Amino acid sequence: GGIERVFTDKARYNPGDAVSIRVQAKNGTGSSWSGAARLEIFHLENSVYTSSQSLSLTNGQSTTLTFTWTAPSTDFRGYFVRIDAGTLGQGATAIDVSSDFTKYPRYGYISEFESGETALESKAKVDQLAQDYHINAWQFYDWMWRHDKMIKRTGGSIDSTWLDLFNREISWSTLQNQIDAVHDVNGKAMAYAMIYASRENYSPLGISPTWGIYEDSSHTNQFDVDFGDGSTYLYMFDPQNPNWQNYIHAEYIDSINTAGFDGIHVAQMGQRSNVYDYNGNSIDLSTRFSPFLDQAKSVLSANNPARDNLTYNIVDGTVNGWAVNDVSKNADLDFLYSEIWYLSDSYNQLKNYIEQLRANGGNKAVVLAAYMNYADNAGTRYEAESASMTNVSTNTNHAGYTGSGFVDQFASTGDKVSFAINAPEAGDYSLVFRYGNNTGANSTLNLYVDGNFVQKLYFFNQSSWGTWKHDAWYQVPLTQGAHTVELRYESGNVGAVNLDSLTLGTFDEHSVRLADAMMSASGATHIELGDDNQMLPHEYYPNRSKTMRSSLKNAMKDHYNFITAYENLLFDSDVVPNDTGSQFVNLTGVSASGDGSANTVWYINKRTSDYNIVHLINLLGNDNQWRNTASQPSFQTNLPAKIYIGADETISDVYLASPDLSGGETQELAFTSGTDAGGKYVSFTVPELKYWNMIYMLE
Numbered sequence: 001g002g003i004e005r006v007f008t009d010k011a012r013y014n015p016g017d018a019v020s021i022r023v024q025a026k027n028g029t030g031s032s033w034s035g036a037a038r039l040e041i042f043h044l045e046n047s048v049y050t051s052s053q054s055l056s057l058t059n060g061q062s063t064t065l066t067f068t069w070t071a072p073s074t075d076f077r078g079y080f081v082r083i084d085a086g087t088l089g090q091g092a093t094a095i096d097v098s099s100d101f102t103k104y105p106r107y108g109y110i111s112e113f114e115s116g117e118t119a120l121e122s123k124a125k126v127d128q129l130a131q132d133y134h135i136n137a138w139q140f141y142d143w144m145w146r147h148d149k150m151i152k153r154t155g156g157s158i159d160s161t162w163l164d165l166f167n168r169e170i171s172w173s174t175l176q177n178q179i180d181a182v183h184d185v186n187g188k189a190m191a192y193a194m195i196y197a198s199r200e201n202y203s204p205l206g207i208s209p210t211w212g213i214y215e216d217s218s219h220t221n222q223f224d225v226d227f228g229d230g231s232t233y234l235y236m237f238d239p240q241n242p243n244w245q246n247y248i249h250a251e252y253i254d255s256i257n258t259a260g261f262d263g264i265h266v267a268q269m270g271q272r273s274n275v276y277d278y279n280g281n282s283i284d285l286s287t288r289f290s291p292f293l294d295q296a297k298s299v300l301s302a303n304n305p306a307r308d309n310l311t312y313n314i315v316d317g318t319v320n321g322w323a324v325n326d327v328s329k330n331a332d333l334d335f336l337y338s339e340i341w342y343l344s345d346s347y348n349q350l351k352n353y354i355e356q357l358r359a360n361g362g363n364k365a366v367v368l369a370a371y372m373n374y375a376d377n378a379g380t381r382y383e384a385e386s387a388s389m390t391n392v393s394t395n396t397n398h399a400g401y402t403g404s405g406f407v408d409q410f411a412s413t414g415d416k417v418s419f420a421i422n423a424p425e426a427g428d429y430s431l432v433f434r435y436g437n438n439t440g441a442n443s444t445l446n447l448y449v450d451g452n453f454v455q456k457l458y459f460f461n462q463s464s465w466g467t468w469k470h471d472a473w474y475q476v477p478l479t480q481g482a483h484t485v486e487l488r489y490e491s492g493n494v495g496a497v498n499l500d501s502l503t504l505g506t507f508d509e510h511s512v513r514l515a516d517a518m519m520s521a522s523g524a525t526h527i528e529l530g531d532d533n534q535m536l537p538h539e540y541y542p543n544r545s546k547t548m549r550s551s552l553k554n555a556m557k558d559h560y561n562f563i564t565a566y567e568n569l570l571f572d573s574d575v576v577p578n579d580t581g582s583q584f585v586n587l588t589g590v591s592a593s594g595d596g597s598a599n600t601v602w603y604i605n606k607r608t609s610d611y612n613i614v615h616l617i618n619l620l621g622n623d624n625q626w627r628n629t630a631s632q633p634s635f636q637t638n639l640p641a642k643i644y645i646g647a648d649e650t651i652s653d654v655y656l657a658s659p660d661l662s663g664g665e666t667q668e669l670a671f672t673s674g675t676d677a678g679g680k681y682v683s684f685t686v687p688e689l690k691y692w693n694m695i696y697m698l699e
């Protein structure tokens with residue numbers, strides 16, 4: 001249909017605020033049209049509001065309706081929004097009423113701060129994320145000048161621009177425009193800062209090496225982070241040291257009061273061991289973040305209670321992981337955040353780590369960084385040996401290449417490889433080259449798109465000609481249809497590469513839908529969206545080596561509506577596991593599992609004071625890894641389910657909501673309860689399972 005968009009002005013509302021629901025419509029049906037748009041808002045199974053407006057439209061013409069509504073008085077509630085326009089079509093969105101984003105955070109990011117970005121454009125990228133996904137907080141990533149001197153001043157004046165550690169130009173006015181825009185959607189701005197990093201040559205800033213942490217007991221090698229140009233490093237300091245606290249806390253305060261941030265997103269480099277202080281005592285670094293964090297929270301709350309938000313990145317998250325118990329149990333954080341690497345690879349493992357962080361933290365919110373399809377060179381592939389190459393030829397003499405071979409000796413002026421690609425729809429494309437380089441140095445090549453120079457791309461030296469990487473990419477705007485993408489070796493380029501393929505880097509809808517379901521069904525959200533509708537492909541946020549296509553965009557809008565509409569059932573302080581032995585689940589005709597086994601329908605049991613909640617995630621046709629790409633699941637329809645309950649509980653009604661079905665609208669189901677040789681039960685037909693169903697049953 002032609003209900004093109006439904007969204008609200010703001011990403012979160014306080015009780016009593018005025019909410020402006022917008023419906024964008026275009027009659028596409030051939031002739032003129034006369035009917036109504038009927039608005040209905042639910043809190044879970046209940047209708048709390050209904051309203052209707054007349055609408056008529058000459059074929060082709062568009063309009064935007066506004067329905068007003070007043071956020072009800074109960075704080076911390078989520079709502080589903082339906083708009084039904086009869087034969088024009090329907091649409092949906094969702095609304096979050098919370099006076100504090102820290103209970104139901106929907107965390108995005110901003111990582112680009114160019115001088116050329118107008119106030120209007122800053123506002124647009126922000127509105128888009130607020131409107132489509134209800135993003136209520138933004139992590140400002142790599143905005144600071146130095147990790148130990150965050151705002152660059154000349155005497156007493158703020159410098160209008162400054163260069164960051166990777167040489168990017170950061171504009172003050174742009175950062176401020178973006179912070180303003182975040183604030184205009186009732187968003188909050190969290191500033192990225194390390195817990196313990198200076199930059200090189202820190203002495204003249206009055207930072208003392210006595211505050212540092214060392215790899216020896218003789219204070220000769222301070223832990224660093226080498227960015228590999230003989231010049232740019234981080235150095236690491238002791239969280240517990242009072243003079244480092246004093247120094248860096250002061251920089252956090254400076255950033256709140258000068259930039260107008262609402263909090264600090266505190267980061268770290270993850271596990272280090274056999275760590276010493278300056279003098280030489282050996283110390284367990286794992287236990288030392290919480291006293292820093294507690295003290296940081298204290299000066300931030302004293303400085304300004306409204307701009308004192310605080311989280312800390314727990315790196316390498318897993319059950320009983322490094323620093324996992326101490327930080328989640330003892331650190332005065334508003335919400336928990338954890339970047340996942342390789343110690344929770346299965347849906348069920350990460351599911352358990354999330355549960356640990358919910359239980360340790362006292363059921364305060366949990367956000368995961370968990371870069372989807374990280375290792376995968378996912379998307380449509382144009383093999384390099386099936387392209388048009390000038391002065392270079394194919395070969396097969398280094399293993400692991402894809403297809404029938406790869407292009408080699410791409411190594412001198414005049415060499416060329418031109419790909420004939422097709423863009424299935426207008427938009428941004430991630431042009432990703434898989435390559436080899438063992439020249440012992442960076443190899444370059446110039447990139448041309450439809451005959452116009454776009455960028456000189458670097459190809460990184462690897463260990464061995466048999467080590468394929470695919471981290472040479474550039475993102476570009478493309479019109480639907482044919483295009484030409486050409487690497488030329490010209491005069492100014494250096495080195496040499498073998499070239500395996502070009503890929504239109506694309507997040508895989510299927511994996512992405514399934515991981516988000518798993519995450520939120522478990523009790524967590526996912527920092528995955530930012531800047532101008534980008535999805536996060538790597539720890540360095542300005543990476544655009546993969547793009548979303550339109551189909552996944554729509555799925556993400558459904559998902560983010562669903563986790564806002566149903567947040568009381570997903571993340572409330574009284575949502576807990578209910579997997580305590582008394583509850584099996586039966587599904588007729590398909591394999592089911594409670595531990596998220598490959599090729600099954602996974603059921604997860606959670607409960608609250610009033611509802612028995614069973615999630616189904618559909619792993620049929622797919623493996624049990626959360627991060628990797630995946631095929632469409634085996635969709636199911638009219639699927640008999642049987643839920644064994646507690647011997648005591650009594651089910652009034654059975655409800656099923658799914659982001660995959662009607663935008664997340666709750667549909668009530670008919671169910672018969674009896675009892676049999678192997679438990680007391682209830683039973684019903686599940687109309688459909690695609691990726692994720694949430695069954696909530698009211699007792």
Ligand SMILES: OC[C@H]1O[C@H](OC[C@H]2O[C@H](OC[C@H]3O[C@H](OC[C@H]4O[C@H](OC[C@H]5O[C@H](OC[C@H]6O[C@H](OC[C@H]7O[C@H](OC[C@H]8O[C@@H](O)[C@H](O)[C@@H](O)[C@@H]8O)[C@H](O)[C@@H](O)[C@@H]7O)[C@H](O)[C@@H](O)[C@@H]6O)[C@H](O)[C@@H](O)[C@@H]5O)[C@H](O)[C@@H](O)[C@@H]4O)[C@H](O)[C@@H](O)[C@@H]3O)[C@H](O)[C@@H](O)[C@@H]2O)[C@H](O)[C@@H](O)[C@@H]1O
Pocket residue numbers: 142166167168194226227228229267268269313315339369442455456457458459460471472473474538539540541543545
């Ligand atoms: O075709 C490719 C592109 O080619 C051109 O641009 C190339 C670059 O050009 C300029 O740089 C010139 C120099 O280029 C080389 O630089 C060497 C570096 O590159 C290699 O790494 C390749 C990866 O590059 C990116 O990843 C960067 C970086 O990200 C992280 O580290 C940075 C991060 O560190 C801390 O934060 C860590 C972490 O903290 C956690 O708590 C948080 O959860 C998490 O979010 C944070 O990430 C700091 O606190 C942060 O401030 C900071 O941001 C990551 O940890 C690190 O490993 C990673 O390297 C890409 O995203 C990725 O895809 C690549 O794999 C080397 O391997 C690396 O060692 C080295 O540092 C040459 O060696 C130099 O000689 C040369 O002078 C630009 O400055 C660069 O931005 C360009 O990439 C085209 O112009 C471009 O269009 C093409 O796309």
Ligand SMILES: OC[C@H]1O[C@H](OC[C@H]2O[C@H](OC[C@H]3O[C@H](OC[C@H]4O[C@H](O)[C@H](O)[C@@H](O)[C@@H]4O)[C@H](O)[C@@H](O)[C@@H]3O)[C@H](O)[C@@H](O)[C@@H]2O)[C@H](O)[C@@H](O)[C@@H]1O
Pocket residue numbers: 398408409410411438439465495496497498
């Ligand atoms: O002292 C280092 C100098 O060489 C560096 O560049 C290395 C080569 O770069 C290009 O070739 C890349 C090529 O490398 C391997 O094969 C090289 C040899 O292997 C074959 O036997 C071939 O017949 C010989 O010509 C060649 O010696 C990979 O296996 C292959 O797939 C790669 O495509 C140039 O074409 C070569 O001339 C270079 O040797 C460095 O970059 C230079 O600056 C240094 O002078």
Ligand SMILES: [Ca+2]
Pocket residue numbers: 383384385401402403404405406499500501
């Ligand atoms: Ca190939």
Ligand code: NA
Pocket residue numbers: 511622623624625626627628629630
């Ligand atoms: Na998988």
